[PDB]
Design an enzyme around this catalytic site. Structure first.
Site, PDB file in Angstrom:
ATOM      1  CE  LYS A 167      34.421  40.562  44.105  1.00 41.44           C
ATOM      2  NZ  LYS A 167      35.084  41.535  43.187  1.00 41.44           N
ATOM      3  CE  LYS A 193      38.608  46.505  48.663  1.00 40.02           C
ATOM      4  NZ  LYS A 193      37.943  46.818  47.412  1.00 40.02           N
ATOM      5  CG  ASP A 195      33.973  45.003  43.311  1.00 33.70           C
ATOM      6  OD1 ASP A 195      35.179  45.060  43.046  1.00 33.70           O
ATOM      7  OD2 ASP A 195      33.342  43.933  43.231  1.00 33.70           O
ATOM      8  CD  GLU A 196      37.234  47.346  41.141  1.00 30.46           C
ATOM      9  OE1 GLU A 196      37.915  46.638  41.885  1.00 30.46           O
ATOM     10  OE2 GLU A 196      36.404  46.859  40.350  1.00 30.46           O
ATOM     11  CG  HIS A 286      40.832  49.305  44.344  1.00 34.23           C
ATOM     12  ND1 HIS A 286      41.035  49.314  42.979  1.00 34.23           N
ATOM     13  CD2 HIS A 286      40.401  48.059  44.650  1.00 34.23           C
ATOM     14  CE1 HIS A 286      40.762  48.119  42.487  1.00 34.23           C
ATOM     15  NE2 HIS A 286      40.375  47.339  43.478  1.00 34.23           N
ATOM     16  CE  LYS A 326      40.191  38.627  40.345  1.00 35.41           C
ATOM     17  NZ  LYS A 326      38.734  38.665  40.616  1.00 35.41           N
TER      18      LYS A 326
HETATM   19  O1  LIG Z   1      37.423  43.301  41.571  1.00 36.30           O
HETATM   20  C1  LIG Z   1      38.279  42.356  42.002  1.00 36.30           C
HETATM   21  O2  LIG Z   1      38.707  41.494  41.090  1.00 36.30           O
HETATM   22  C2  LIG Z   1      38.726  42.228  43.456  1.00 36.30           C
HETATM   23  O3  LIG Z   1      37.643  42.651  44.190  1.00 36.30           O
HETATM   24  C3  LIG Z   1      38.964  40.787  43.964  1.00 36.30           C
HETATM   25  O4  LIG Z   1      37.822  39.907  44.046  1.00 36.30           O
HETATM   26  P1  LIG Z   1      37.966  38.462  44.408  1.00 36.30           P
HETATM   27  O5  LIG Z   1      38.499  38.544  45.906  1.00 36.30           O
HETATM   28  O6  LIG Z   1      36.500  37.921  44.202  1.00 36.30           O
HETATM   29  O7  LIG Z   1      39.011  37.924  43.346  1.00 36.30           O
HETATM   30  C4  LIG Z   1      39.997  43.043  43.838  1.00 36.30           C
HETATM   31  O8  LIG Z   1      39.746  44.399  43.827  1.00 36.30           O
HETATM   32  C5  LIG Z   1      41.274  42.868  43.026  1.00 36.30           C
HETATM   33  O9  LIG Z   1      41.998  42.063  43.867  1.00 36.30           O
HETATM   34  C6  LIG Z   1      42.110  44.048  42.544  1.00 36.30           C
HETATM   35  O10 LIG Z   1      43.447  43.722  42.125  1.00 36.30           O
HETATM   36  P2  LIG Z   1      44.674  44.142  42.821  1.00 36.30           P
HETATM   37  O11 LIG Z   1      44.471  43.780  44.350  1.00 36.30           O
HETATM   38  O12 LIG Z   1      45.771  43.311  42.071  1.00 36.30           O
HETATM   39  O13 LIG Z   1      44.750  45.713  42.541  1.00 36.30           O
HETATM   40 MG   LIG Z   2      37.481  44.896  43.382  1.00 34.79          MG
END
Ligand SMILES: O=C(O)[C@@](O)(COP(=O)(O)O)[C@H](O)[C@H](O)COP(=O)(O)O
Ligand SMILES: [Mg+2]
Ligand SMILES: O=C(O)[C@@](O)(COP(=O)(O)O)[C@H](O)[C@H](O)COP(=O)(O)O
Ligand SMILES: O=C(O)[C@@](O)(COP(=O)(O)O)[C@H](O)[C@H](O)COP(=O)(O)O
Ligand SMILES: [Mg+2]
Ligand SMILES: [Mg+2]
Ligand SMILES: [Mg+2]
Lengths: 467, 109, 467, 117, 116, 109, 234
Positions: A167, A193, A195-196, A286, A326
Site C-alpha cells: 500500500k 503482492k 494490488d489487483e 485475485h 472488512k
Molecule cells: O485491495 C484490498 O482491499 C486488499 O489488498 C486487502 O488489503 P488489506 O490487507 O490492506 O485490507 C485485498 O485484495 C482484498 O482482500 C480483496 O478481497 P477479497 O480477498 O475478499 O477478494
Molecule cells: Mg488488493
C-alpha cells in the site's frame, strides 16, 4: 417420428419441464433460485430457464425436427419453494454433456447464465450451484500445480503461509515498491503482492516494478534463508501483453505471478493457467469484481460457482474471504466453498450451501487466500477456520505497524506460529486465542505493538449473502 | 518509538518462536502421531532454502506409536551428525504431503 | 510536508471526502448508487468507496508519505440522496487520469468495481455511469470499423439491417446449420448468426460449421445479388483457440465474426478487436451474461457502463435490447445508451439515465442490435425506436414461420422495407404501423402468414431496472 | 493374416549394408557414451523407481537421490510414468534434476536418470 | 543362437544391452558372465526393497558388482565361484550381507515358451 | 535394524572395494596385458567427474609386456606428483575405448 | 496406517487379488485370457498381471507407504475358467482413472500390455477387451470428422462407398500411378488408394505421386460429376 411441424408459440413447460427425469452422471446440473413475475407459474418459469439456456426459443421452429431434441434439451426436473419466502423457488435443471465445449468455462457460462437472467417473465434469478460431471471435469487442466506441489516447490510445510498487499494501492514508484517489498519479506512474510489494480501506469510501469521487486526478493531470501515470493500482476489489456508480462517474470526466475480472472476474463485466464503449467510458475488468482455478481442472494451467481469455475480454468491460489475482516463472507457458506476448492469429493450439504455432491477426479486443490481488513487479533480465528492449507494476507496489517514493514511482518509471523504451536498442543484457539497472543506479546515487542494498535478494531455488520 | 528489526537467518516453521524445549518437541510429535502422520528424520550440512532434498535418517517411522521412539532416533542422529541441521517431519500418505516440519538441531555454531 | 506518520485507523472521510473538489476534464468520474449499513454515515460510506477503489486501505500506512497522495487519491466530491427512497444515495467520485493503464478496460474496471461492492459497511452498490475523459478515450482503438465504414464495406444503405439467430440453439449438425443459413439468407435477411453458446461441441465442431456456412453465404449471395454475412462465433476456451478460429474465418473470406465479450472477457475481446482492425473483419458483440450484472437497480453495474466499455475495447455491433421483446429493456434507459454507443457527444440527461456528458473524440460508433422475442408486428416500433442505424434480428421470428426460413426471411424484409418507405413518406409509425403492415400483407402472402401467426404475441411485464 | 496360412513368425531380416547406411542409428552408441559419462571398466548400474505409479514428484526425486547417492549410476522412470494426475511430468523433471545434482556432488561420480519423454 | 543371416553394420554404433527385471545381488555373477562390461544392470525392487532403504540397497548392488568384476579380472570363475565371491564381499559390507540374506531363496525358473 | 549410509566421495571403478593391495593392482595390470589393452597412466590435481581430461604421464605403454613396467611408471609418477590423483587406464585401440580405469593414488589428504 | 515396512517377497495375490471389488464407472477394465505355468495358481497369476501392469514389482518396497496404494493399485476382481479348455482363464482387472495420461493411447497400452506378456510364470496372455471409462474417453479428440461429417463433406449418401488399391503394390512410376487412378475413378469408384507400403521409394518419390494423382482426381471428377478422392499415404 419427427412429429409434424406446427408453427406457433407453445408453453416452454410442454417441452422443458420434466419432473420425472432422473439425472445421469454425465449431466451438468444447475440450481437456480428464482422469483417469477406475477401470473407466471413456477413450472413455466423453470421450463423457460431450461429452454433458453439450452436449445429453445420463444416460438416453435421446424429445425428441431432435423435432430433429436430429447437428446439435447435442458430439463427442469425439480422445482421447490424456498422455505419461508414468498414467490421464491429453486429450479434444478439437467444439461446433457453434449451441450458443452470441452475445457471451456467460457462456453459453460454462456449457456447457463448467458441470456436467462434478463428474461421479462422472471423478476430475479441467482445461480446457486453447478454439478460438474466427472467426464467434463477431466477435459480441463485445472490448477497449474495445486496445493501439495506448491508446498513442495516452496519448501513450505506445517502452517498457513503469510502474504501482504503493498500500500498505497496506487501511487508508489517502482523503486519504492521494491523497498516496501524487501522490508516486508525480510521480516518474516512468505509473500508480498501487487494490488489487483497495479498493472502498468504512468507512476509505475510494469517492467520496472518486475525488475526492482526481483531484487527485493533476492536480498530478503538471502537474509532470511527462507523461500520468498511476490505475486507479480500480469493482468493486461490484451492476451499479448499478458503473455509478455508473464514471460519476463519467468525470465527473472520469479516463482509466482497473479491474475485478475474476472476483469481479464476466463479466456485469458485459461491461456495463462496453461502457460503456468508449461513454465512452472505458480498462479495466484485475485477475484476482483466478484461481489458485483455474488453479493445479493436474490440475483446473480454465488461465489461457490465462481470458485468451481476457477479451479477448472486454473489457479493455484484463490481469495476466499476472511469472514471476520472488512469485506463480506458468510462463515457457513465459506466453509462450504473452501471444501469445494480444496477437496476431491464434497457431499451435498445445504446447511453450507452445497446443493450438489461434487467430485473432482483428482484435479489438484486450490489454496484459499484470506485477505482484507485483518490484523493480529484475527489470527486464531483465521487458523481455526482455514487450517494449515491457506494463505493469510495482511496489507494494512503489516505496513500499518507503528514501526514499519519488517517489524509488522515479524508481528504477524510470530502471531501465526504461536497459534499453530498452541493448536498442535491441544489448546482451543477460540477460547484461548487472546491469551496465546498475549503470551507471545510478552517476548515479542513488535507483536505487542501491533496488539495494542488494533485491539479495538472489528468489522461486524449484517451479512447480505445469507443462505 | 520503534526498533530496527535485526537480521537473523530463519528455518521455516516455529523458527520465530523461542527454541522449543524437549517437552515442546515431544508435544509436536504427539500431534503427529495422533493425526496419523508418519515421522521422518532428515539431516543436512546446510540450510539452503532453494534445495529440495535433505538426507534421510534410516527410514520413516511408519508405525510410530511412541513420541519417545522418535526422540530416540533424533538423539541417535545427533550423535552421528552433530555438525548438521536435523529436522523432524511428519508425512501424510493419503494427501501425500509433508504436514509437519521443524528444525530440532542446528550444528555447532 | 510529509505530515508525520501516525499509525492507526482513521475515518476514510478525513482523506477521501472532498465536497469542495471540482473535477478536472482529465478526471475519470463515477456515479455510484449505494445504501450504507445502519450506523454508517453516507459521507463515510462514499469516502470508503473512493478510498478502496483508488489508493486507500483500512488503516494508516507510512508509505503514503513517500508519494503525493493528493495527486493520486480518489475523491468523493458529491453525495445526494435518491429522491423518494430511504437510505439510498448517489456518490460522485473523481479519479485522476494517472490511476489507469492506457487502453485497458480491464484495469479501469479492476479499480472502479474491483473490491468495493463487497464492503461490509455497504448493503448494496450499483455503478450507474462513468465519464471517460477524452485523454483516456484516445488511448483506445475502439470499434475496428464502426457504423459508417461498415455500411460502406457491405453496400448497405438506407434502412436497418436484418439478422437472424439459427435455432435450435444447440443440436444441429454443421450441414444442417448451413442449410438453415442458406434458406434464411436467400429469403432477404442480410445476416444470420451462431447462437452465443454455439462454439465447438460434439454435435457440431467449429471448423465444420465455418466450412458449411461459407458455402451457404456464397450460394445465397449469388442468388440474391446482395452482400450476405453470418456472424461466426469465435468465442473459445483460450486466446489461442479464439485466434485460430478468427483466422480460419478470414481464410474463408468471411466478412464478419462474433464474440461473447463478457463470458470470454475484456482481455480476449481487446485482442480480437485489434486483430479485426488489422484483418478487415467486422466484429459483432454478444452481451451474454450482462443481466447477471445489470438487471437489478440496487446492486451491480448498469448496462450503459458496459456499453461504454465495449465501445472502448472494440466492437462493430453490440446488442442493445428490444424494449418490446422477450428480454427486459427500459425504453428511456435504452434511448440513452443507444446514444452513448452511437454518437460523438452525449449531454448529461438524468431522465434517460445519462449522469455525465460523454465525448468520444471521433471514436466510431457501434451499431445497436435489437434481438430477442420479436416478430413482424414489432417492426414499426423497432424502426421508430432505433432508426436506420441498427440491426434487427429475428431468430424464432424467421425459422418459426409456417412455411420455413426463406419465406420467413421475406416476411421480415418486406415488413421492414414497408415501414422505412412509410416513415420516409411522413406516415406515423406508431399510429399507423398496424395499417402499414396490413397493407403490405395484402400483396405479400408470406408476410400475411406471419402476421396471422404472431398477432396475439406480446411481452408486457414490470421492468425491474427502473431509473 | 492370410487365410491360407495358420501361423507366421518373422525370425530374422538381413539388412543390406546399402540400406543400413541410409539410417542414423544410435545417437551416440557404446563408446561415445562411456566417454561422455567417464564410465569405464565395468557394467553400469541402474534402478527403476517403485511403486510404478502413485508417487508425487517430490517423493520421486527423494527416492532417486537416495538411490544415486548410494552408488548406482542411473535411476529411471517406470515405462508407464509419463504425465498423470498424481505426478505431472514437468514437476518430476524439476525435482529429479535436483536429486541428480545433490547425489553427483556428494559422490564425485556422474549420475543420470532416464526421464521418460 | 538364432542368427539366420550374417549381419554387417558398416560401423553403425552399437547399443548397450540393459538387463532388468526381477534380479537381485545373487544374480550378479551370472549377469556379469553373460553380458560382460558393456551392459547396464538394473535393480528396481532389488534396490528399493533392501531392508535398510535405497542408499544401502544401492551400495549392496555396487559392491556386489565391483567384487565380481575384480574377481573375473583376477581369473576367478564367476559361474563356479560366484556365491563365494559374494559371501566374501558380504563379510565387509553389512548392506550387501543384508541383501544376500533377504533374497537368498528367490529364483525364477520356468519353461521357456520362446524356444529356438 | 539399519544404518544410515555415510557420505564419502568415490572414484569410479573399484572405489567401493577395500583399497587395492599392490598385488591386487598388479593382477589388474596383468588382466590388461593379457587382454591386449595398452596401459596409460594419467594424473590430475582434482577428481571432478564433469571433466573429460586428465594429464598424460609420458606416453601410453604401447607394447607393455610387464606389469612391473607399468608399476615402475606409477612409482615414478607418484614421486613427481604425490599431490595428485593418479589413475591407471587400459586402452582398446580396436574398439578405440578405455577398457580399464582405476585410481592407484590419492593425494596427501 | 502405513503398516510397517517388512522387506521381502510376498505373493502378488495378497495385495492385488480383490474378488470382492466392485468396479467404479471411472475404472478402466481389462479382460485377459491367460494360461499359468504348471504350479502357478490362477489367482496368483491374475494378481501378478494386475500388479505388474499398475503399481507392483517382484519384492516389497518401502516407498509404497509414502502413498495410498489402495487408491492406485490394479485390482484383479474376477477370474473364470474358459469353458471347455484346460488351464485357460479370463482375468478381469480394474485400473483407477488416475493411472493414465489424458488423451494418450500410448500410455494406456504401456501399462496394460507393457511388461506382463513376457512374465515367466505365465505361458500365454491375450488382451481381449478394455472398457474405456467415459471420463477418459472425453480426454481424447477421436475421429477428425467421423461418419456423418464425412458423408456431408463428400456429398455421398445412400449406399456404401467404393475404393480400390492400385496394383502392383510397388514398381509403378508416379505418372503410371496417376494413370491407373484416373481410369479407376472415371469408371465409378469413389476412392482409390496408395498401397500401405507405398511411401517414398526410388521408383516413385512421394511428391511426384501426389502431383500426378491430384491431376487424375481433377480430370475424373470433372468427367463424372461426382466427388473423387485418393488416400495419399503420408
Ligand atoms: O485491495 C484490498 O482491499 C486488499 O489488498 C486487502 O488489503 P488489506 O490487507 O490492506 O485490507 C485485498 O485484495 C482484498 O482482500 C480483496 O478481497 P477479497 O480477498 O475478499 O477478494
Ligand atoms: Mg488488493
Ligand atoms: O438466444 C437468444 O434468445 C437470441 O438468439 C434471440 O433468439 P430469438 O430471435 O429466437 O428470440 C438472442 O441472442 C438474444 O436476443 C440475446 O439477448 P440480448 O439481445 O437482449 O442480449
Ligand atoms: O516394470 C518393470 O517390471 C521393470 O521396471 C523392472 O523392475 P524391477 O527392477 O523392480 O523388476 C523393468 O522395466 C522390466 O525389466 C522390463 O522388462 P524388460 O527389461 O524384459 O523389457
Ligand atoms: Mg442467442
Ligand atoms: Mg519398468
Ligand atoms: Mg494394401
Amino acid at each position: 417420428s419427427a412429429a409434424g411441424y406446427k408453427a406457433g408459440v407453445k408453453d416452454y413447460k410442454l417441452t422443458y419441464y420434466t419432473p420425472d427425469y432422473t439425472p445421469k452422471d454425465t449431466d451438468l446440473l444447475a440450481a437456480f433460485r428464482f422469483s417469477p413475475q406475477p401470473g407466471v407459474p413456477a413450472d413455466e418459469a423453470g421450463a423457460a430457464i431450461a429452454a433458453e439456456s439450452s436449445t429453445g426459443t420463444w416460438t416453435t421452429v421446424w429445425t428441431d425436427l432435423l435432430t433429436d431434441m430429447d437428446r439435447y434439451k435442458g430439463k427442469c426436473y425439480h422445482i421447490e419453494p424456498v422455505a419461508g419466502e414468498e414467490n421464491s423457488y429453486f429450479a434444478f435443471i439437467a444439461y446433457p454433456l453434449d451441450l458443452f465445449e470441452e475445457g471451456s468455462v467460457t462456453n459453460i457460462l454462456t449457456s447457463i447464465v448467458g441470456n436467462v437472467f434478463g428474461f421479462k417473465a422472471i423478476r430475479s434469478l441467482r445461480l446457486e450451484d453447478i454439478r460438474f460431471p466427472v467426464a467434463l471435469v477431466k477435459t480441463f487442466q485445472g490448477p497449474p500445480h495445486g496445493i501439495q506441489v506448491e508446498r513442495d516447490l516452496l519448501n513450505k510445510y506445517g502452517r498457513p503461509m503469510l502474504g501482504c498487499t503493498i500500500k498505497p494501492k496506487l501511487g508508489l514508484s517502482a523503486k519504492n515498491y521494491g523497498r516496501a517489498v524487501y522490508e516486508c519479506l525480510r521480516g518474516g512474510l512468505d509473500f508480498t503482492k501487487d494490488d489487483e489494480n497495479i498493472n502498468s501506469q504512468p507512476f509505475q510501469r510494469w517492467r520496472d516494478r518486475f525488475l526492482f521487486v526481483a531484487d527485493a526478493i533476492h536480498k530478503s531470501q538471502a537474509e532470511t534463508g527462507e523461500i520468498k515470493g511476490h505475486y507479480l500482476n500480469v493482468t493486461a489489456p490484451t492476451c499479448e501483453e499478458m503473455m509478455k508480462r508473464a514471460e519476463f517474470a519467468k525470465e527473472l526466475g520469479m516463482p509466482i505471478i497473479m491474475h485478475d480472472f474476472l476483469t481479464a476474463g476466463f479466456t485469458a485466464n485459461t491461456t495463462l493457467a496453461k502457460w503456468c503449467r508449461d513454465n512452472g510458475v505458480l498462479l495466484h488468482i485475485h477475484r476482483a469484481m466478484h461481489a458485483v455478481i455474488d453479493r445479493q442472494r436474490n440475483h446473480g451467481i454465488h461465489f461457490r460457482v465462481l470458485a468451481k469455475c476457477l479451479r477448472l480454468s486454473g489457479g493455484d491460489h484463490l481469495h476466499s474471504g476472511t469472514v471476520v475482516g472488512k469485506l463480506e463472507g458468510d462463515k457457513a457458506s465459506t466453509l462450504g466453498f473452501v471444501d469445494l476448492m480444496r477437496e476431491d469429493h464434497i457431499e451435498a450439504d445445504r446447511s453450507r450451501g452445497v446443493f450438489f455432491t461434487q467430485d473432482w477426479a483428482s484435479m489438484p486443490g486450490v489454496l484459499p487466500v484470506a485477505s482484507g481488513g485483518i490484523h493480529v487479533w484475527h489470527m486464531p480465528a483465521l487458523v481455526e477456520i482455514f487450517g494449515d492449507d491457506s494463505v493469510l494476507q495482511f496489507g494494512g496489517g503489516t505496513l500499518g505497524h507503528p514501526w514499519g514493514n519488517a517489524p509488522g511482518a515479524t508481528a504477524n509471523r510470530v502471531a501465526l506460529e504461536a497459534c499453530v504451536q498452541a493448536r498442535n498442543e491441544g489448546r482451543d484457539l477460540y477460547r484461548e486465542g487472546g491469551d496465546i497472543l498475549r503470551e507471545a506479546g510478552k517476548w515479542s515487542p513488535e507483536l505487542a505493538a501491533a496488539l495494542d494498535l488494533w485491539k479495538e478494531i472489528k468489522f461486524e455488520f449484517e451479512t447480505m449473502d445469507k443462505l | 518509538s520503534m526498533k530496527t528489526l535485526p537480521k537473523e537467518r530463519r528455518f521455516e516453521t516455529f523458527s520465530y518462536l523461542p527454541p522449543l524445549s524437549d517437552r515442546q518437541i515431544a508435544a509436536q510429535i504427539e500431534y503427529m502421531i495422533e493425526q496419523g502422520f508418519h515421522p521422518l528424520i532428515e539431516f543436512n550440512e546446510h540450510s539452503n532454502p532453494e534445495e529440495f532434498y535433505w538426507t534421510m535418517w534410516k527410514l520413516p517411522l511408519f508405525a510410530c506409536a511412541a513420541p519417545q521412539q522418535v526422540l530416540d532416533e533424533v538423539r541417535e542422529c545427533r550423535s552421528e551428525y552433530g555438525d548438521c541441521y536435523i529436522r523432524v517431519a511428519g508425512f501424510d500418505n493419503i494427501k501425500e504431503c509433508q504436514t509437519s516440519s521443524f528444525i530440532v538441531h542446528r550444528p555447532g555454531r
